[PDB]
């Protein structure tokens, strides 16, 4: 918005871990204001994760997340007809948001049984970096380097 | 744009109601339909008598009509005579036993209803409409109305296309709720159909 430069809202930290960055992940995963059942799915699929990649439950997230975190993206921009994809160096906070959001659009796409399976296997494969959330980060780092000309 | 009714937005702030009786849901629709007919009567009778405002309350069983009017003499007739033959056709229309009162209106130039009735009268005996408006504004302002607009509408001097000339003088603040804006309205029935006449009358605030 034009005038209206603004603050932002304190989310509560996550009750089990005390992890403010993981609360944002249940919000992103939540549908229809059912935060309850988002938490069920997440807390589950970190048990299934942290067990099968040598422990640390905060830090099995933050290895898988660090892998998908971007560093540049495009930002399309008209000059007078043809339209210039400009690479632009992404903010600290928006790094995580895009990462988290891509993890979940990847997880929501697969064909395992539960969601807590689907999530656990697209946090496994992030940390050993294949599967669709890093195929997203790679096909964004193409676009930034393919259009590195324009900045 | 269309304005909110200035009487109606100001009820229970600075204007009071005119029907001031309590009911429950059995008898509410009936009281309304009585109070309608007791007003629809007393307008038709007292047309010459210059009537601002017919308050109705209902204590006990009984109905109690106050009338406000410029001309107490012509309602009271002689020794009442007329008051007392209003009561016994009112007390049919209600059903209950009745009680008429009267109040004066000291300045008929400052009542909206009477100013409008006045102007509406002159338009039926074929007076030029700009005189009729402009008399009424002057008259209120020399008796110390803080302001006043009037607004006639629709086939003026028997034109073939409707217009609405209007004419303020002084201050008339209609978004101020605190303001006492005496307002009212009237239809002139002419040979060129109807002409409608609004009148606002600011009298100061609180």
């Amino acid at each position: 918005p034009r005038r209206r430069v603004i603050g932002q809202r304190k989310i509560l930290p996550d009750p089990k871990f005390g992890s403010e960055l993981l609360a944002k992940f249940v919000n992103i995963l939540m549908v229809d204001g059912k935060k309850s059942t988002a938490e069920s799915i997440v807390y589950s699929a970190l048990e299934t994760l942290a067990q099968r990649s040598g422990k640390s439950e905060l830090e099995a997230f933050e290895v898988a997340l660090e892998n998908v975190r971007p560093t540049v993206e495009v930002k399309s921009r008209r000059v007078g007809g043809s339209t210039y994809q400009v690479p632009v160096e992404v903010r600290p906070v928006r790094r995580n948001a895009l990462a988290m959001r891509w993890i979940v659009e990847a997880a929501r796409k697969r064909g395992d049984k539960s969601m807590a399976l689907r999530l656990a296997n697209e946090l496994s494969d992030a940390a050993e970096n294949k599967g669709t959330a890093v195929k997203k980060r790679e096909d964004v780092h193409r676009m930034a380097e393919a259009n590195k000309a324009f900045a | 744009g269309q304005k909110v009714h200035p009487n109606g937005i100001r009820l229970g702030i600075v204007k009071p109601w005119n029907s001031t009786w309590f009911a429950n849901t059995k008898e509410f629709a009936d009281n309304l339909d009585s109070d309608f007919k007791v007003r629809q009567y007393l307008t038709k009778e007292l047309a010459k008598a210059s009537v601002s405002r017919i308050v109705i309350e209902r204590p006990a069983k009984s109905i109690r009509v106050t009338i406000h009017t410029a001309r107490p003499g012509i309602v009271i007739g002689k020794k009442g005579e007329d008051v007392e033959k209003l009561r016994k056709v009112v007390a049919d229309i209600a059903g209950v036993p009745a009680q008429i009162n009267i109040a004066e209106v000291r300045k008929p130039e400052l009542d909206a209803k009477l100013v409008a009735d006045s102007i509406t009268s002159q338009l039926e005996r074929r007076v030029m409409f700009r005189r009729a408006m402009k008399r009424a504004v002057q008259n209120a302002m020399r008796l110390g109305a803080k302001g006043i607009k009037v607004e006639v509408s629709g086939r003026l001097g028997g034109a073939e296309i409707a217009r609405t000339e209007w004419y303020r003088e002084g201050r008339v603040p209609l978004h101020t709720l605190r303001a006492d804006i005496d307002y009212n309205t009237s239809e002139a029935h002419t040979t060129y159909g109807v002409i409608g006449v609004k009148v606002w009358i600011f009298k100061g605030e609180i």
Binding site: - | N7, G8, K15, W17, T20, W21, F22, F28, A29
Partner: protein
């Protein structure tokens, strides 16, 4: 509405007070009751022979002023149009514009 259609809703009230309110309120119980008589109803056949506008079903509400069938409001006995005209003059007591 018309003068005819306002006259029709006096005709239909005139009946239903005289008849059904007493006499059909007998026969609607004789047609009901299972634990008394199941053969000499006779009453089902007699409920037809009452005039048809004795039923309160057949009464529409009109706005006790303009006679308008739609837009009715039971508390006031009035169309939505005349409620509002009367509200704003101050002829309906206690009624003001709300906000919350």
């Amino acid at each position: 509405a018309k003068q005819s259609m306002k006259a029709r809703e006096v005709k239909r009230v005139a009946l239903a007070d005289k008849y059904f309110a007493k006499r059909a309120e007998l026969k609607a119980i004789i047609s009901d009751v299972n634990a008394s008589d199941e053969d000499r109803w006779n009453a089902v056949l007699k409920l037809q022979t009452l005039p048809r506008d004795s039923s309160p079903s057949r009464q529409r509400n009109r706005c006790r002023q303009t006679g308008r069938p739609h837009g009715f409001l039971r508390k006031f006995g009035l169309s939505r149009i005349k409620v509002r005209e009367a509200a704003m003059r101050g002829e309906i007591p206690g009624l003001k514009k709300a906000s919350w």
